[PDB]
Design a protein around this motif. Structure first.
Motif, PDB file in Angstrom:
ATOM      1  N   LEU A  54     -14.772   4.952 -34.735  1.00  0.00           N
ATOM      2  CA  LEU A  54     -13.316   4.774 -34.656  1.00  0.00           C
ATOM      3  C   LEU A  54     -12.990   3.322 -34.313  1.00  0.00           C
ATOM      4  O   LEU A  54     -12.049   2.805 -34.899  1.00  0.00           O
ATOM      5  CB  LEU A  54     -12.738   5.728 -33.612  1.00  0.00           C
ATOM      6  N   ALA A  55     -13.772   2.680 -33.441  1.00  0.00           N
ATOM      7  CA  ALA A  55     -13.515   1.284 -33.051  1.00  0.00           C
ATOM      8  C   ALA A  55     -13.565   0.437 -34.326  1.00  0.00           C
ATOM      9  O   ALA A  55     -12.720  -0.439 -34.562  1.00  0.00           O
ATOM     10  CB  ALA A  55     -14.547   0.787 -32.062  1.00  0.00           C
ATOM     11  N   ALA A  56     -14.551   0.685 -35.190  1.00  0.00           N
ATOM     12  CA  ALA A  56     -14.687  -0.072 -36.449  1.00  0.00           C
ATOM     13  C   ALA A  56     -13.492   0.202 -37.357  1.00  0.00           C
ATOM     14  O   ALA A  56     -12.984  -0.735 -37.994  1.00  0.00           O
ATOM     15  CB  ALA A  56     -16.005   0.265 -37.119  1.00  0.00           C
ATOM     16  N   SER A  62      -6.307  -5.307 -26.624  1.00  0.00           N
ATOM     17  CA  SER A  62      -7.701  -5.391 -27.096  1.00  0.00           C
ATOM     18  C   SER A  62      -8.111  -4.051 -27.661  1.00  0.00           C
ATOM     19  O   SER A  62      -7.558  -2.996 -27.250  1.00  0.00           O
ATOM     20  CB  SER A  62      -8.631  -5.820 -26.007  1.00  0.00           C
ATOM     21  N   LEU A  63      -9.114  -4.076 -28.540  1.00  0.00           N
ATOM     22  CA  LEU A  63      -9.608  -2.849 -29.173  1.00  0.00           C
ATOM     23  C   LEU A  63      -9.958  -1.755 -28.171  1.00  0.00           C
ATOM     24  O   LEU A  63      -9.652  -0.565 -28.494  1.00  0.00           O
ATOM     25  CB  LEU A  63     -10.779  -3.238 -30.076  1.00  0.00           C
ATOM     26  N   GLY A  64     -10.566  -2.028 -27.014  1.00  0.00           N
ATOM     27  CA  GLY A  64     -10.936  -0.949 -26.076  1.00  0.00           C
ATOM     28  C   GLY A  64      -9.684  -0.202 -25.622  1.00  0.00           C
ATOM     29  O   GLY A  64      -9.784   0.977 -25.300  1.00  0.00           O
ATOM     30  N   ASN A  65      -8.530  -0.861 -25.528  1.00  0.00           N
ATOM     31  CA  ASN A  65      -7.263  -0.156 -25.170  1.00  0.00           C
ATOM     32  C   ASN A  65      -6.959   0.957 -26.180  1.00  0.00           C
ATOM     33  O   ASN A  65      -6.596   2.091 -25.729  1.00  0.00           O
ATOM     34  CB  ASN A  65      -6.057  -1.057 -25.078  1.00  0.00           C
ATOM     35  N   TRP A  66      -7.087   0.664 -27.465  1.00  0.00           N
ATOM     36  CA  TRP A  66      -6.752   1.631 -28.531  1.00  0.00           C
ATOM     37  C   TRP A  66      -7.774   2.772 -28.539  1.00  0.00           C
ATOM     38  O   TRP A  66      -7.381   3.927 -28.760  1.00  0.00           O
ATOM     39  CB  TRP A  66      -6.695   0.880 -29.867  1.00  0.00           C
ATOM     40  N   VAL A  67      -9.061   2.446 -28.344  1.00  0.00           N
ATOM     41  CA  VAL A  67     -10.129   3.466 -28.365  1.00  0.00           C
ATOM     42  C   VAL A  67      -9.910   4.380 -27.147  1.00  0.00           C
ATOM     43  O   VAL A  67     -10.052   5.618 -27.228  1.00  0.00           O
ATOM     44  CB  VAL A  67     -11.518   2.785 -28.422  1.00  0.00           C
ATOM     45  N   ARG A 116     -18.275  -1.011 -25.889  1.00  0.00           N
ATOM     46  CA  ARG A 116     -19.607  -1.572 -25.463  1.00  0.00           C
ATOM     47  C   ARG A 116     -20.692  -0.993 -26.365  1.00  0.00           C
ATOM     48  O   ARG A 116     -20.684   0.202 -26.602  1.00  0.00           O
ATOM     49  CB  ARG A 116     -19.858  -1.268 -23.982  1.00  0.00           C
ATOM     50  N   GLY A 117     -21.567  -1.838 -26.923  1.00  0.00           N
ATOM     51  CA  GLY A 117     -22.686  -1.343 -27.739  1.00  0.00           C
ATOM     52  C   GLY A 117     -22.313  -1.152 -29.192  1.00  0.00           C
ATOM     53  O   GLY A 117     -23.236  -0.951 -30.006  1.00  0.00           O
ATOM     54  N   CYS A 118     -21.027  -1.195 -29.548  1.00  0.00           N
ATOM     55  CA  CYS A 118     -20.602  -1.005 -30.954  1.00  0.00           C
ATOM     56  C   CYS A 118     -20.877  -2.272 -31.762  1.00  0.00           C
ATOM     57  O   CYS A 118     -20.564  -3.392 -31.281  1.00  0.00           O
ATOM     58  CB  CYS A 118     -19.126  -0.667 -31.083  1.00  0.00           C
TER      59      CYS A 118
END
Ligand code: NA
Length: 129
Positions: free
Chosen positions: A8-10, A24-29, A125-127
């Motif tokens: 999903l992050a991608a 930032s992307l982590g907010n949306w995920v 993290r790790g993606c």
């Protein structure tokens, strides 16, 4: 479809949500995790009779048409069903309109209560992005 976290992050990054309106992307995920557990087919009925749809639980009161929310708008110009697609394009396009509405990601009560102010980078993290 139930996305994987990094999947999903991608998909979100490819649709331009990473740092959209400064989020930032982590907010949306993180918001998607608590809204839908990454399930595009998630639905929730509100007390007011509106319904929340999809990975980001977008509501029929303002943003989509479902034919059963009296007095409501369709500001994203979509049927709410489009928000349940395995393709997140409609959800992302409509999230961009929502987050531009004045209150940023506070529009998502679960983001304010569970993501806001936390270490949201842990969600990407790790993606491989
Ligand atoms: Na509506």
């Amino acid at each position: 479809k139930v996305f994987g976290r990094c999947e999903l992050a991608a998909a979100m990054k490819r649709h331009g949500l990473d740092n959209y309106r400064g989020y930032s992307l982590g907010n949306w995920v993180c918001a998607a995790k608590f809204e839908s557990n990454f399930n595009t087919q998630a639905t929730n009925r509100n007390t007011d009779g509106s319904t929340d749809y999809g990975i980001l639980q977008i509501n029929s009161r303002w943003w989509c048409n479902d034919g059963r929310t009296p007095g409501s708008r369709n500001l994203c110009n979509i049927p709410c069903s489009a928000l349940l697609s395995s393709d997140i394009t409609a959800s992302v396009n409509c999230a961009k309109k929502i987050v531009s509405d004045g209150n940023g990601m506070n529009a998502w009560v679960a983001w304010r209560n569970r993501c806001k102010g936390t270490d949201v980078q842990a969600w990407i993290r790790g993606c491989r992005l």
